[PDB]
RNA sequence: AUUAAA
RNA sequence: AUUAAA
């Protein structure tokens, strides 16, 4: 069986990071019941268009309060991921070099991941409300 | 991702071929490469395939209750919810002998017949509007599936 | 338990 | 011009 993979995991050179991630990744709607669906949407952060604006700070605010309040008022969970999301950039490269699925996202572009867990008709409406409020953060020029 | 792929090809070339599963998995990860923007705020496409309960209600035909006379009640729902709803899956066609239609010819046009009988709600709008339209459509479509 | 739209 | 949440 595939447990051959376990023999590869221990014996593979740690210098191959993406292969060791893929091998460890390989370890393996009804509306009338109306149980809780989960959704997610990855929203790009326009650093190409606004390179002089720091979005990560405007989004989080003091001790993350502004992101917490948006999460609370939209009833969603938001996570800032991608290249440039971490505060320590030397740690961000070594964690990207670490190439663990948890930190794998750093290879991608700076973006927000909004998650919502609710019954389906509510879960879609909550995500739509969150997408309307988050653009005020991602659009400095929202006047006109 | 301009940084990710050159490291895969570097691993591909430098890796020991004796690792067959690991080398196969990085090749599968390479074949993949051969996400919303709200400041440009262009239209996305959302869809949700909503099964309708024939296992729970085998005696109730929903597809007729959904369409109505000449599809008036379904188009009225598509108008008020501003979505495109298409009934697909096994039993969607009224003629079930002409169903299992081709399907060994294998056209993705007809591939949906292998899926269970459902309703695919598609909505085309900007992301904030698209997600809010879908949520409203799922609100109203319950009323057809709860006799 | 006759609803058939795109 | 600062903000650093999970």
GROMACS .gro file of C-alpha atoms (C1' of nucleotides) in nm:
model
  303
    1UNK     CA    1   0.000   0.000   0.000
    2UNK     CA    2   0.071   0.377  -0.012
    3UNK     CA    3   0.230   0.362   0.341
    4UNK     CA    4   0.542   0.344   0.122
    5UNK     CA    5   0.500   0.720   0.159
    6UNK     CA    6   0.580   0.691   0.530
    7UNK     CA    7   0.910   0.528   0.434
    8UNK     CA    8   0.972   0.824   0.202
    9UNK     CA    9   0.881   1.083   0.467
   10UNK     CA   10   1.146   0.978   0.718
   11UNK     CA   11   1.417   0.896   0.462
   12UNK     CA   12   1.380   1.196   0.228
   13UNK     CA   13   1.634   1.478   0.239
   14UNK     CA   14   1.473   1.774   0.423
   15UNK     CA   15   1.626   2.003   0.159
   16UNK     CA   16   1.341   1.905  -0.075
   17UNK     CA   17   1.064   2.108   0.086
   18UNK     CA   18   0.773   2.096  -0.158
   19UNK     CA   19   0.798   1.720  -0.213
   20UNK     CA   20   0.799   1.658   0.162
   21UNK     CA   21   0.490   1.879   0.189
   22UNK     CA   22   0.303   1.697  -0.088
   23UNK     CA   23   0.386   1.358   0.063
   24UNK     CA   24   0.256   1.467   0.404
   25UNK     CA   25  -0.048   1.620   0.233
   26UNK     CA   26  -0.105   1.270   0.089
   27UNK     CA   27  -0.155   1.106   0.433
   28UNK     CA   28  -0.505   1.011   0.315
   29UNK     CA   29  -2.598   2.070  -0.102
   30UNK     CA   30  -2.932   1.996   0.066
   31UNK     CA   31  -3.129   2.303   0.170
   32UNK     CA   32  -3.418   2.132   0.351
   33UNK     CA   33  -3.193   1.986   0.623
   34UNK     CA   34  -3.038   2.336   0.641
   35UNK     CA   35  -2.733   2.240   0.844
   36UNK     CA   36  -2.428   2.466   0.858
   37UNK     CA   37  -2.237   2.521   0.533
   38UNK     CA   38  -1.882   2.656   0.520
   39UNK     CA   39  -1.766   2.910   0.260
   40UNK     CA   40  -1.449   3.094   0.171
   41UNK     CA   41  -1.336   3.363  -0.070
   42UNK     CA   42  -0.984   3.492  -0.137
   43UNK     CA   43  -0.984   3.868  -0.198
   44UNK     CA   44  -0.677   4.019  -0.361
   45UNK     CA   45  -0.510   4.313  -0.186
   46UNK     CA   46  -0.422   4.578  -0.452
   47UNK     CA   47  -0.057   4.644  -0.369
   48UNK     CA   48   0.019   4.663  -0.742
   49UNK     CA   49  -0.226   4.953  -0.777
   50UNK     CA   50  -0.150   5.118  -0.440
   51UNK     CA   51   0.214   5.034  -0.358
   52UNK     CA   52   0.249   5.322  -0.109
   53UNK     CA   53  -0.056   5.220   0.098
   54UNK     CA   54  -0.008   4.971   0.382
   55UNK     CA   55  -0.324   4.761   0.389
   56UNK     CA   56  -0.218   4.510   0.656
   57UNK     CA   57  -0.197   4.787   0.915
   58UNK     CA   58  -0.519   4.961   0.812
   59UNK     CA   59  -0.697   4.624   0.822
   60UNK     CA   60  -0.568   4.506   1.161
   61UNK     CA   61  -0.540   4.835   1.349
   62UNK     CA   62  -0.427   4.848   1.712
   63UNK     CA   63  -0.389   4.493   1.849
   64UNK     CA   64  -0.608   4.369   1.563
   65UNK     CA   65  -0.915   4.555   1.691
   66UNK     CA   66  -1.042   4.680   1.355
   67UNK     CA   67  -1.018   4.335   1.196
   68UNK     CA   68  -1.183   4.181   1.503
   69UNK     CA   69  -1.471   4.429   1.481
   70UNK     CA   70  -1.522   4.363   1.109
   71UNK     CA   71  -1.519   3.990   1.181
   72UNK     CA   72  -1.770   4.048   1.461
   73UNK     CA   73  -2.004   4.279   1.268
   74UNK     CA   74  -2.003   4.073   0.946
   75UNK     CA   75  -2.006   3.743   1.144
   76UNK     CA   76  -1.717   3.609   0.935
   77UNK     CA   77  -1.357   3.502   0.996
   78UNK     CA   78  -1.092   3.696   0.803
   79UNK     CA   79  -0.727   3.596   0.766
   80UNK     CA   80  -0.451   3.800   0.600
   81UNK     CA   81  -0.222   3.568   0.401
   82UNK     CA   82   0.023   3.577   0.112
   83UNK     CA   83   0.352   3.749   0.040
   84UNK     CA   84   0.415   4.035   0.282
   85UNK     CA   85   0.147   3.943   0.537
   86UNK     CA   86   0.387   3.868   0.824
   87UNK     CA   87   0.558   4.144   1.021
   88UNK     CA   88   0.898   3.972   1.035
   89UNK     CA   89   1.009   3.937   0.674
   90UNK     CA   90   1.317   3.726   0.749
   91UNK     CA   91   1.094   3.485   0.939
   92UNK     CA   92   0.844   3.493   0.650
   93UNK     CA   93   1.104   3.371   0.399
   94UNK     CA   94   1.229   3.091   0.624
   95UNK     CA   95   0.870   2.983   0.691
   96UNK     CA   96   0.810   2.988   0.316
   97UNK     CA   97   1.136   2.795   0.285
   98UNK     CA   98   0.993   2.570   0.557
   99UNK     CA   99   0.720   2.493   0.304
  100UNK     CA  100   0.468   2.353   0.550
  101UNK     CA  101   0.105   2.355   0.435
  102UNK     CA  102   0.029   2.593   0.722
  103UNK     CA  103   0.283   2.845   0.589
  104UNK     CA  104   0.257   2.743   0.221
  105UNK     CA  105   0.028   3.041   0.150
  106UNK     CA  106   0.324   3.282   0.153
  107UNK     CA  107   0.405   3.176  -0.205
  108UNK     CA  108   0.082   3.348  -0.312
  109UNK     CA  109   0.001   3.718  -0.349
  110UNK     CA  110  -0.110   3.929  -0.054
  111UNK     CA  111  -0.480   3.862  -0.004
  112UNK     CA  112  -0.761   3.829   0.250
  113UNK     CA  113  -0.937   3.497   0.308
  114UNK     CA  114  -1.292   3.543   0.438
  115UNK     CA  115  -1.462   3.239   0.593
  116UNK     CA  116  -1.821   3.198   0.709
  117UNK     CA  117  -1.988   2.898   0.876
  118UNK     CA  118  -2.368   2.903   0.881
  119UNK     CA  119  -2.680   2.761   0.711
  120UNK     CA  120  -2.653   2.808   0.334
  121UNK     CA  121  -2.885   3.105   0.272
  122UNK     CA  122  -2.737   3.289   0.570
  123UNK     CA  123  -2.376   3.191   0.494
  124UNK     CA  124  -2.397   3.343   0.146
  125UNK     CA  125  -2.555   3.666   0.273
  126UNK     CA  126  -2.292   3.703   0.546
  127UNK     CA  127  -2.010   3.663   0.294
  128UNK     CA  128  -2.172   3.920   0.066
  129UNK     CA  129  -2.204   4.169   0.350
  130UNK     CA  130  -1.838   4.112   0.438
  131UNK     CA  131  -1.726   4.171   0.079
  132UNK     CA  132  -1.909   4.506   0.077
  133UNK     CA  133  -1.744   4.634   0.396
  134UNK     CA  134  -1.392   4.506   0.328
  135UNK     CA  135  -1.357   4.705   0.005
  136UNK     CA  136  -1.358   5.028   0.208
  137UNK     CA  137  -1.032   4.900   0.356
  138UNK     CA  138  -0.888   4.790   0.020
  139UNK     CA  139  -0.990   5.112  -0.161
  140UNK     CA  140  -0.814   5.423  -0.021
  141UNK     CA  141  -0.975   5.642  -0.290
  142UNK     CA  142  -1.331   5.528  -0.203
  143UNK     CA  143  -1.427   5.895  -0.242
  144UNK     CA  144  -1.532   5.887  -0.608
  145UNK     CA  145   0.322   3.242  -0.856
  146UNK     CA  146   0.659   3.316  -1.013
  147UNK     CA  147   0.864   3.192  -0.716
  148UNK     CA  148   0.687   2.860  -0.656
  149UNK     CA  149   0.730   2.681  -0.990
  150UNK     CA  150   1.109   2.728  -1.037
  151UNK     CA  151   1.161   2.550  -0.704
  152UNK     CA  152   0.941   2.259  -0.815
  153UNK     CA  153   1.136   2.218  -1.139
  154UNK     CA  154   1.456   2.244  -0.935
  155UNK     CA  155   1.329   1.964  -0.711
  156UNK     CA  156   1.207   1.770  -1.016
  157UNK     CA  157   1.552   1.779  -1.177
  158UNK     CA  158   1.758   1.732  -0.859
  159UNK     CA  159   1.538   1.478  -0.680
  160UNK     CA  160   1.628   1.111  -0.660
  161UNK     CA  161   1.411   0.916  -0.910
  162UNK     CA  162   1.397   0.631  -0.656
  163UNK     CA  163   1.126   0.829  -0.476
  164UNK     CA  164   0.844   0.746  -0.714
  165UNK     CA  165   0.543   0.884  -0.527
  166UNK     CA  166   0.715   1.209  -0.426
  167UNK     CA  167   0.849   1.266  -0.778
  168UNK     CA  168   0.504   1.189  -0.920
  169UNK     CA  169   0.336   1.433  -0.681
  170UNK     CA  170   0.561   1.725  -0.779
  171UNK     CA  171   0.489   1.644  -1.145
  172UNK     CA  172   0.116   1.655  -1.073
  173UNK     CA  173   0.176   1.988  -0.899
  174UNK     CA  174   0.353   2.112  -1.213
  175UNK     CA  175   0.071   2.004  -1.446
  176UNK     CA  176  -0.174   2.217  -1.246
  177UNK     CA  177  -0.024   2.548  -1.359
  178UNK     CA  178  -0.003   2.474  -1.732
  179UNK     CA  179  -0.959   3.471  -0.660
  180UNK     CA  180  -1.138   3.803  -0.631
  181UNK     CA  181  -1.035   4.163  -0.701
  182UNK     CA  182  -1.275   4.417  -0.548
  183UNK     CA  183  -1.109   4.742  -0.659
  184UNK     CA  184  -1.172   4.661  -1.025
  185UNK     CA  185  -1.507   4.524  -0.898
  186UNK     CA  186  -1.589   4.335  -1.217
  187UNK     CA  187  -1.845   4.055  -1.234
  188UNK     CA  188  -1.768   3.712  -1.094
  189UNK     CA  189  -1.966   3.392  -1.144
  190UNK     CA  190  -2.105   3.199  -0.848
  191UNK     CA  191  -2.285   2.869  -0.855
  192UNK     CA  192  -2.434   2.628  -0.604
  193UNK     CA  193  -2.576   2.288  -0.695
  194UNK     CA  194  -2.880   2.242  -0.471
  195UNK     CA  195  -3.000   1.884  -0.448
  196UNK     CA  196  -3.373   1.839  -0.409
  197UNK     CA  197  -3.490   1.556  -0.176
  198UNK     CA  198  -3.610   1.255  -0.372
  199UNK     CA  199  -3.466   1.028  -0.101
  200UNK     CA  200  -3.678   1.202   0.162
  201UNK     CA  201  -3.982   1.261  -0.062
  202UNK     CA  202  -3.995   0.989  -0.331
  203UNK     CA  203  -4.369   1.045  -0.381
  204UNK     CA  204  -4.334   1.419  -0.455
  205UNK     CA  205  -4.222   1.546  -0.795
  206UNK     CA  206  -4.044   1.876  -0.736
  207UNK     CA  207  -3.930   1.941  -1.094
  208UNK     CA  208  -4.290   2.002  -1.198
  209UNK     CA  209  -4.355   2.212  -0.888
  210UNK     CA  210  -4.046   2.419  -0.973
  211UNK     CA  211  -4.118   2.486  -1.341
  212UNK     CA  212  -4.497   2.514  -1.339
  213UNK     CA  213  -4.694   2.578  -1.658
  214UNK     CA  214  -4.445   2.647  -1.939
  215UNK     CA  215  -4.179   2.720  -1.677
  216UNK     CA  216  -4.361   3.030  -1.550
  217UNK     CA  217  -4.297   2.970  -1.180
  218UNK     CA  218  -3.928   2.893  -1.234
  219UNK     CA  219  -3.870   3.194  -1.460
  220UNK     CA  220  -4.064   3.410  -1.215
  221UNK     CA  221  -3.825   3.287  -0.946
  222UNK     CA  222  -3.527   3.346  -1.176
  223UNK     CA  223  -3.654   3.700  -1.238
  224UNK     CA  224  -3.716   3.790  -0.873
  225UNK     CA  225  -3.390   3.634  -0.750
  226UNK     CA  226  -3.193   3.760  -1.055
  227UNK     CA  227  -3.026   3.421  -1.103
  228UNK     CA  228  -3.008   3.147  -1.365
  229UNK     CA  229  -3.146   2.819  -1.230
  230UNK     CA  230  -3.099   2.505  -1.440
  231UNK     CA  231  -3.237   2.164  -1.339
  232UNK     CA  232  -2.976   1.891  -1.396
  233UNK     CA  233  -2.900   1.536  -1.285
  234UNK     CA  234  -3.063   1.197  -1.316
  235UNK     CA  235  -3.434   1.232  -1.386
  236UNK     CA  236  -3.418   1.598  -1.488
  237UNK     CA  237  -3.530   1.514  -1.841
  238UNK     CA  238  -3.893   1.409  -1.865
  239UNK     CA  239  -3.796   1.129  -2.106
  240UNK     CA  240  -3.582   0.896  -1.895
  241UNK     CA  241  -3.515   0.645  -2.173
  242UNK     CA  242  -3.357   0.915  -2.388
  243UNK     CA  243  -3.175   0.988  -2.061
  244UNK     CA  244  -2.859   0.800  -1.968
  245UNK     CA  245  -2.810   1.002  -2.283
  246UNK     CA  246  -2.496   0.904  -2.471
  247UNK     CA  247  -2.270   0.930  -2.164
  248UNK     CA  248  -2.038   0.667  -2.307
  249UNK     CA  249  -1.976   0.923  -2.581
  250UNK     CA  250  -1.859   1.140  -2.292
  251UNK     CA  251  -1.954   1.499  -2.374
  252UNK     CA  252  -1.934   1.736  -2.075
  253UNK     CA  253  -2.247   1.888  -2.229
  254UNK     CA  254  -2.437   1.579  -2.107
  255UNK     CA  255  -2.201   1.484  -1.820
  256UNK     CA  256  -2.439   1.632  -1.561
  257UNK     CA  257  -2.671   1.331  -1.596
  258UNK     CA  258  -2.431   1.123  -1.383
  259UNK     CA  259  -2.488   1.367  -1.094
  260UNK     CA  260  -2.787   1.339  -0.862
  261UNK     CA  261  -3.100   1.534  -0.949
  262UNK     CA  262  -3.042   1.893  -0.839
  263UNK     CA  263  -3.083   2.263  -0.917
  264UNK     CA  264  -2.776   2.464  -1.023
  265UNK     CA  265  -2.818   2.831  -0.926
  266UNK     CA  266  -2.578   3.056  -1.118
  267UNK     CA  267  -2.551   3.431  -1.056
  268UNK     CA  268  -2.336   3.684  -1.245
  269UNK     CA  269  -2.262   4.008  -1.060
  270UNK     CA  270  -1.987   4.189  -0.866
  271UNK     CA  271  -1.870   3.982  -0.568
  272UNK     CA  272  -2.067   4.160  -0.294
  273UNK     CA  273  -2.383   4.157  -0.505
  274UNK     CA  274  -2.324   3.804  -0.637
  275UNK     CA  275  -2.296   3.651  -0.290
  276UNK     CA  276  -2.600   3.842  -0.162
  277UNK     CA  277  -2.810   3.740  -0.462
  278UNK     CA  278  -2.725   3.373  -0.408
  279UNK     CA  279  -2.824   3.395  -0.042
  280UNK     CA  280  -3.160   3.543  -0.136
  281UNK     CA  281  -3.216   3.276  -0.402
  282UNK     CA  282  -3.155   2.995  -0.153
  283UNK     CA  283  -3.407   3.162   0.079
  284UNK     CA  284  -3.686   3.151  -0.179
  285UNK     CA  285  -3.599   2.812  -0.331
  286UNK     CA  286  -3.668   2.637   0.000
  287UNK     CA  287  -4.037   2.723  -0.037
  288UNK     CA  288  -4.053   2.498  -0.344
  289UNK     CA  289  -3.878   2.203  -0.172
  290UNK     CA  290  -4.080   2.204   0.154
  291UNK     CA  291  -4.438   2.092   0.063
  292A      C1'  292  -5.137   1.161  -0.859
  293U      C1'  293  -5.079   1.443  -1.633
  294U      C1'  294  -4.696   2.171  -1.439
  295A      C1'  295  -4.099   2.084  -1.846
  296A      C1'  296  -3.831   2.624  -1.835
  297A      C1'  297  -3.340   2.754  -2.011
  298A      C1'  298   0.149   5.705   0.910
  299U      C1'  299   0.166   5.489   1.292
  300U      C1'  300  -0.146   4.990   1.351
  301A      C1'  301   0.015   4.310   1.332
  302A      C1'  302  -0.503   3.986   1.439
  303A      C1'  303  -0.556   3.419   1.399
   0.00000   0.00000   0.00000
